[PDB]
Symmetry: D2
Subunit: 116 residues, 4 copies
């Protein structure tokens, strides 16, 4: 588990369940290439995106599909997605947890980075 | 010297007509009323105090979030938000809060 | 585990370890009475505050000692504490997780409430 | 029609001299430069666009948080913050962001 994503819903006070998450990695030609994707569980967590072998150094983008989440709850949200873009593993492998907190017109994200 | 600004993360708007009470901690560790008001159409509450009144000490800003949410028909978690801080050269304090039904964030802008 | 507290540090990207947490409950005479206290672990979590028997309906205050946390890291913070005040168990027992994210001049908190 | 405001949660201040670039999504799903500037002493960036230029569509506001933190000597996690949204009666948009080294929050104030 070198990359984990956790999503919470600030309106309902609950995990944000069935949220699609797409991860990209910057290629040598400076475009975003697909890297991994998945969906949050009933706990709001997404494990198993990648492996220690696959998760090399690079610039990664995690795009959390908040628009589809809100629309499925019958709410018209503001943002297309929540995200982080970050350089990973530059000083060696780390474990990253990306935690996102969602409201219809707002989001916040934090990273928890541990060594391992 | 002290301004409060409140935003609503659900509706994407200023939080209007929110009651705010400020207290200063007394020598017996109790909370003495100090200033209060309601946020304006811009979500701001100006005019709470004067330089001469606002001395160093511990202050509590209580934002009545529960009444706010209920007046909008939205189910809230917190009773209120209580933002407690120590006031310590030339300085103006803005206490800013961003509200959601089951979460809030606050930050201080000290200039 | 009907009440859990998790604290994260937004400056370091880490759990906030060894953070004191004090929980109070409003008494019949409208004052705050002590209810429980503890400290976050190396994961930033605090389990074992209370029990299903002890955690009755009431208005609770969770005071997270953020000032001592920052001061121990050699930083002068703004707030005395991070907190939540909430009515608990009004529609029957629930499990509450209070998640706090700390910066020297800011904090945010969220509640995750589950039935169980 | 579009304003950006940035706050610093570490120093308790406006985030001053932060580069901001706005992009509009083109028909081929690429990001076409639209507006840019640097936040002022108040943390605000006004004058990005005009009513006639700001049409419905998908916009990205990229805030260069990494350069901000490094100019303050503080070690940052994100490359930048990318705030992407759809613009849809009379409306003004404020994109507000609160920055910490390993976290940011953003909200929209639509009036
Ligand atoms: O599991 C989580 C998710 C989000 C969190 N958060 C993000 C911003 N504020 C809290 C905290 C913990
Ligand atoms: O969680 C927050 C709070 C305040 C914010 N802000 C208010 C004014 N400028 C940024 C943004 C995000
Ligand atoms: Ca390297
Ligand atoms: Ca002093
Ligand atoms: Ca009851
Ligand atoms: Ca339309």
């Amino acid at each position: 588990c070198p990359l984990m994503v956790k999503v919470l819903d600030a309106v309902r006070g609950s995990p944000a369940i069935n949220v699609a998450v797409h991860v990209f990695r910057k290629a040598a030609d400076d475009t975003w290439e697909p890297f991994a994707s998945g969906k949050t569980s009933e706990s709001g967590e997404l494990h198993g995106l990648t492996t220690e072998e696959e998760f090399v150094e690079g610039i990664y983008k995690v795009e959390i599909d908040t628009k589809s989440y809100w629309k499925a709850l019958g709410i018209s949200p503001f943002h297309e997605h929540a995200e982080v873009v970050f350089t990973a593993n530059d000083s060696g492998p780390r474990r990253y947890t990306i935690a996102a907190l969602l409201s219809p017109y707002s989001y916040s994200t934090t990273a928890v980075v541990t060594n391992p």
